[PDB]
Amino acid sequence: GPSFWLGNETLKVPLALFALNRQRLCERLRKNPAVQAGSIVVLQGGEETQRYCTDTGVLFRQESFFHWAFGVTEPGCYGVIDVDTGKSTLFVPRLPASHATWMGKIHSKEHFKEKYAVDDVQYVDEIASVLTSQKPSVLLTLRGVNTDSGSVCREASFDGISKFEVNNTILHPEIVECRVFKTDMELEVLRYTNKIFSEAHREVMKAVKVGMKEYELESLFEHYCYSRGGMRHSSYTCICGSGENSAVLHYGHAGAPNDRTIQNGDMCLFDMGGEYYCFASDITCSFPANGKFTADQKAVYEAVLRSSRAVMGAMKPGVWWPDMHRLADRIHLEELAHMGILSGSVDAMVQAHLGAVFMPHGLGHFLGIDVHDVGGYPEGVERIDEPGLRSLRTARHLQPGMVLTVEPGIYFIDHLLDEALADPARASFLNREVLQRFRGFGGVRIEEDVVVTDSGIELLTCVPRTVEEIEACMAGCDKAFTPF
Amino acid sequence: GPSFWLGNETLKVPLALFALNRQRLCERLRKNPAVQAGSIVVLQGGEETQRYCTDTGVLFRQESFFHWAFGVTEPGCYGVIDVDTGKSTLFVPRLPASHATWMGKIHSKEHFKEKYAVDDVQYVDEIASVLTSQKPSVLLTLRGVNTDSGSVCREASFDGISKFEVNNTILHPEIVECRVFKTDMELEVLRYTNKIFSEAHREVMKAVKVGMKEYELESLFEHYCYSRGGMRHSSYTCICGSGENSAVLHYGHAGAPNDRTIQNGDMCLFDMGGEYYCFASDITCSFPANGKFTADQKAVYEAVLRSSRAVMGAMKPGVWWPDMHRLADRIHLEELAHMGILSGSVDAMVQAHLGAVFMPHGLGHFLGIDVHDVGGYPEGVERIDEPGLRSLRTARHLQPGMVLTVEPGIYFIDHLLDEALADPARASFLNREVLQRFRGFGGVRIEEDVVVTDSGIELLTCVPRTVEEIEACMAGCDKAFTP
Ligand code: PRO
Numbered sequence: 001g002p003s004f005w006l007g008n009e010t011l012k013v014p015l016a017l018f019a020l021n022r023q024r025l026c027e028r029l030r031k032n033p034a035v036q037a038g039s040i041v042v043l044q045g046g047e048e049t050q051r052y053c054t055d056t057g058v059l060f061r062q063e064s065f066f067h068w069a070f071g072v073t074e075p076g077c078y079g080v081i082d083v084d085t086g087k088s089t090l091f092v093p094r095l096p097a098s099h100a101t102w103m104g105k106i107h108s109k110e111h112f113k114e115k116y117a118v119d120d121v122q123y124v125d126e127i128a129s130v131l132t133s134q135k136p137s138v139l140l141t142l143r144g145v146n147t148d149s150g151s152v153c154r155e156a157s158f159d160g161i162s163k164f165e166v167n168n169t170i171l172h173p174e175i176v177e178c179r180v181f182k183t184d185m186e187l188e189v190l191r192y193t194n195k196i197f198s199e200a201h202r203e204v205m206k207a208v209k210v211g212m213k214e215y216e217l218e219s220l221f222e223h224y225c226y227s228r229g230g231m232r233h234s235s236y237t238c239i240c241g242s243g244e245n246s247a248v249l250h251y252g253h254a255g256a257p258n259d260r261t262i263q264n265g266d267m268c269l270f271d272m273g274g275e276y277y278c279f280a281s282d283i284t285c286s287f288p289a290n291g292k293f294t295a296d297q298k299a300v301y302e303a304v305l306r307s308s309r310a311v312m313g314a315m316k317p318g319v320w321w322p323d324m325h326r327l328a329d330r331i332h333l334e335e336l337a338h339m340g341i342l343s344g345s346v347d348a349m350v351q352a353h354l355g356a357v358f359m360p361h362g363l364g365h366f367l368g369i370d371v372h373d374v375g376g377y378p379e380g381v382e383r384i385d386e387p388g389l390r391s392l393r394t395a396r397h398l399q400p401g402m403v404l405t406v407e408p409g410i411y412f413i414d415h416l417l418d419e420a421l422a423d424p425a426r427a428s429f430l431n432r433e434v435l436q437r438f439r440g441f442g443g444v445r446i447e448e449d450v451v452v453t454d455s456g457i458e459l460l461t462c463v464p465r466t467v468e469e470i471e472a473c474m475a476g477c478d479k480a481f482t483p484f
Numbered sequence: 485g486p487s488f489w490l491g492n493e494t495l496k497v498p499l500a501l502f503a504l505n506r507q508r509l510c511e512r513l514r515k516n517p518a519v520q521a522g523s524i525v526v527l528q529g530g531e532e533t534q535r536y537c538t539d540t541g542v543l544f545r546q547e548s549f550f551h552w553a554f555g556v557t558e559p560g561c562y563g564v565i566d567v568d569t570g571k572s573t574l575f576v577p578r579l580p581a582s583h584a585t586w587m588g589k590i591h592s593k594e595h596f597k598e599k600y601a602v603d604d605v606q607y608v609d610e611i612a613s614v615l616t617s618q619k620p621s622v623l624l625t626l627r628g629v630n631t632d633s634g635s636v637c638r639e640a641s642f643d644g645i646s647k648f649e650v651n652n653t654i655l656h657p658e659i660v661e662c663r664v665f666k667t668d669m670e671l672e673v674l675r676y677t678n679k680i681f682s683e684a685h686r687e688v689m690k691a692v693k694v695g696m697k698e699y700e701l702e703s704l705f706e707h708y709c710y711s712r713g714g715m716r717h718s719s720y721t722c723i724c725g726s727g728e729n730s731a732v733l734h735y736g737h738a739g740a741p742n743d744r745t746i747q748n749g750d751m752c753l754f755d756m757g758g759e760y761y762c763f764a765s766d767i768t769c770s771f772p773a774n775g776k777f778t779a780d781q782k783a784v785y786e787a788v789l790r791s792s793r794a795v796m797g798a799m800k801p802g803v804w805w806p807d808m809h810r811l812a813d814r815i816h817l818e819e820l821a822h823m824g825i826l827s828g829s830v831d832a833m834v835q836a837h838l839g840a841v842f843m844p845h846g847l848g849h850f851l852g853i854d855v856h857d858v859g860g861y862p863e864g865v866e867r868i869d870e871p872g873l874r875s876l877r878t879a880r881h882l883q884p885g886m887v888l889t890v891e892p893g894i895y896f897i898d899h900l901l902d903e904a905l906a907d908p909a910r911a912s913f914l915n916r917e918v919l920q921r922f923r924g925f926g927g928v929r930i931e932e933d934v935v936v937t938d939s940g941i942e943l944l945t946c947v948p949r950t951v952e953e954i955e956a957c958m959a960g961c962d963k964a965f966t967p
């Protein structure tokens with residue numbers, strides 16, 4: 001069958017991937033006792049948007065559920081699935097003649113049918129007539145709450161939809177659950193995005209020089225990924241945090257746009273990712289700007305390497321993700337105590353939530369079509385109201401087919417350190433004279449992407465990770481990729 | 485005073501630029517009979533957005549009128565200007581403590597006052613109280629129609645604004661008119677954006693090889709502009725059209741995403757643009773993929789070079805922009821006839837609107853904080869209902885300080901050609917025996933950015949333009965090498 005491809009060495013993604021997702025969704029819905037025979041899933045694709053009141057176009061990226069089901073890159077579409085038969089119908093815009101001048105060839109419905117390997121293609125202006133002729137019992141539309149943004153998913157609507165029976169509660173939990181478990185075809189794409197991003201991280205480690213701006217490395221990474229990987233869209237704003245900026249967890253946004261000069265002695269924390277055909281990946285590398293770890297840098301870094309690998313080594317089906325987060329906390333505290341930053345009983349430190357002072361974010365998150373992927377907190381799975389754990393993006397137990405980031409870190413964040421020092425329950429653990437040396441250190445984060453298997457995990461990411469590996473990578477002469 | 489800067493060799497932009505814009509707006513409003521004493525201009529900045537229902541952030545770019553007035557890069561702000569005194573007050577978000585963990589330092593109001601060189605800074609939630617204390621006669625807010633998108637500008641609103649007198653008709657045409665005329669400080673930024681984009685276009689011409697995907701060149705261009713120019717944001721999606729794709733005017737969007745393999749013999753049309761600190765520029769270079777113009781490519785290309793240079797040489801204050809569009813049409817028709825593609829009376833071709841078959845878009849547009857900048861069709865300036873001319877983004881007369889693109893092109897667009905061949909009014913002008921050779925050629929567009937001056941124009945763009953200059957650039961010749 002057909003495949004999405006951007007030529008050269010980019011990955012061919014079969015449109016069969018989306019057909020399988022549609023099948024899986026129907027299979028799940030058929031088992032839901034509330035689902036009536038004759039139901040039709042109705043999804044609405046994204047539309048082109050512009051900047052404020054201007055005619056400046058925003059680069060179009062498909063809505064994630066719609067992509068998951070159909071893989072359609074064009075704006076202005078709808079897609080429906082007959083639950084009982086699995087039959088798919090794509091609705092495409094009927095375009096004006098002037099499109100051929102400004103935008104490109106006006107493709108036939110048959111072109112789209114072949115391109116997307118759906119059962120039928122119709123024009124958007126006929127959606128009410130077409131669905132009427134199919135005599136559905138109920139239209140199943142998408143409405144629910146994303147548990148990372150708190151936003152409500154936008155339900156499909158079209159002129160005439162008021163004449164149908166519409167249910168907007170059943171679909172969301174079911175399609176979310178399908179997205180949580182990746183098919184082998186989806187995993188192939190995530191292996192590819194990890195390959196390209198792993199290569200680009202290596203090129204950045206090779207190219208970094210003291211005196212560069214953070215954004216120079218962001219730019220190089222993005223250029224490698226687009227020109228060599230076909231990765232055009234960003235799945236999130238890149239974090240290139242040097243020096244004290246590596247303690248700022250989502251550094252790099254408009255308010256803090258990666259314009260610090262990298263200095264001799266800095267630690268760099270490079271959290272850079274993106275997507276291919278709307279499949280995301282998310283990798284973080286930490287390394288000394290000047291290519292040589294100091295003793296302090298080695299100690300902090302190897303603490304996070306230790307928790308990274310202890311978590312990966314423990315992950316397998318049935319493991320509770322919050323237990324992995326607490327495992328990382330305990331290891332960080334042990335290592336910070338060995339360094340002399342902390343003293344006392346690590347058991348007592350854990351009871352006082354001291355780990356969250358050094359790792360205030362969740363250990364890691366589901367990954368898929370969104371970087372913070374859906375389904376972390378389905379009905380019955382509660383957020384834990386404790387420091388650190390409350391920021392976890394899932395409190396689920398692991399099952400085969402889940403894709404997770406594993407991203408422990410240790411940071412020196414002044415307002416958290418200052419809170420802890422003011423609190424007698426935590427202050428006693430902290431050795432102020434040693435900690436003072438680490439003020440302004442920033443932090444270290446090591447982020448791997450993994451898939452849960454029947455027996456453990458498959459690591460998707462492949463970057464240098466030990467101190468010796470990183471130092472060797474940075475000292476390499478072959479860049480093999482020199483734009484100007 | 486303070487400046488915006490991204491270090492290295494990027495441009496330092498004084499915040500005085502925005503203070504001057506505020507002063508100019510107040511001076512214009514003071515002369516407006518609809519404006520009473522005690523008025524306050526109220527603008528609302530852009531907010532952060534996310535992709536659909538996800539927590540995936542969209543890179544924040546400031547709303548253009550707000551930027552013009554304040555130069556503020558942070559989301560969630562408001563800004564007000566006392567018309568009588570020019571006093572400026574910036575309102576910034578009151579941030580949660582957790583911001584310090586995830587997003588960065590929580591800056592004081594004094595930090596922002598110093599950063600932006602405004603007269604006062606307050607928190608956004610205090611805006612009703614602060615404006616109440618100033619006892620304004622009326623709040624002047626922004627509402628009007630963008631004549632390229634047809635969208636209505638978003639008017640500022642806040643909790644409690646219903647307790648004020650609000651006027652939303654006065655401000656828009658006045659702040660638009662201010663934006664139409666660039667200050668010397670604004671021109672410095674547009675000289676810089678043209679410098680970086682011109683350099684990046686040269687790098688693309690040097691790097692292009694038969695067999696590359698179009699998007700490889702898009703990527704290289706963007707990398708130059710960001711890493712060397714600090715140009716992070718795109719002001720529109722790059723058009724990297726090879727072969728027949730060069731006849732698709734806004735090629736490169738999600739539906740046609742620059743994924744064609746460049747072939748020997750292709751013409752390339754690279755319309756590649758962007759912005760620095762929300763100041764745009766927009767440049768198009770056309771060139772043979774293999775670095776050597778064929779006779780046919782030279783002829784089409786030099787036809788557009790001729791119209792480009794004729795328009796640039798004719799532009800000056802008082803010139804009616806539609807007359808420049810028709811000048812380009814006449815030159816294209818003359819040159820297409822000199823090539824043997826057309827025959828007959830060129831006067832008759834013009835009367836038949838034949839130029840629009842080959843150039844269906846407007847000759848060029850205002851440029852500024854938006855790539856298609858505001859103010860092309862103020863009240864009383866009408867769109868001309870003729871082929872080609874109806875696509876013009878302004879029908880104004882030129883005045884000093886306007887910034888325009890000059891972007892004639894010639895394309896071979898099958899459905900427009902076929903329409904002309906079916907039309908007895910146009911068909912006889914076309915010589916199929918020669919035209920058939922140009923089917924699938926794509927097209928050529930040459931786009932320069934210029935400033936209208938007292939004496940004519942200032943050309944901002946600096947890229948190779950003659951056949952010899954382009955061939956030298958693609959062969960890796962240094963700059964300052966003069967064929
Ligand atoms: O947002 C999150 O969950 C992770 C934490 C560090 C950066 N990304």
Ligand code: PRO
Pocket residue numbers: 733734755845846849877
């Ligand atoms: O949109 C416009 O007015 C011009 C025409 C060619 C591409 N940009």
Ligand code: MH2
Pocket residue numbers: 271272273282283284405407447
């Ligand atoms: O977390 Mn990246």
Ligand code: MH2
Pocket residue numbers: 755756757766767768891931
């Ligand atoms: O038109 Mn560029």
Ligand SMILES: [Mn+2]
Pocket residue numbers: 282365405407447
């Ligand atoms: Mn992550």
Ligand SMILES: [Mn+2]
Pocket residue numbers: 766849889891931
């Ligand atoms: Mn233009």
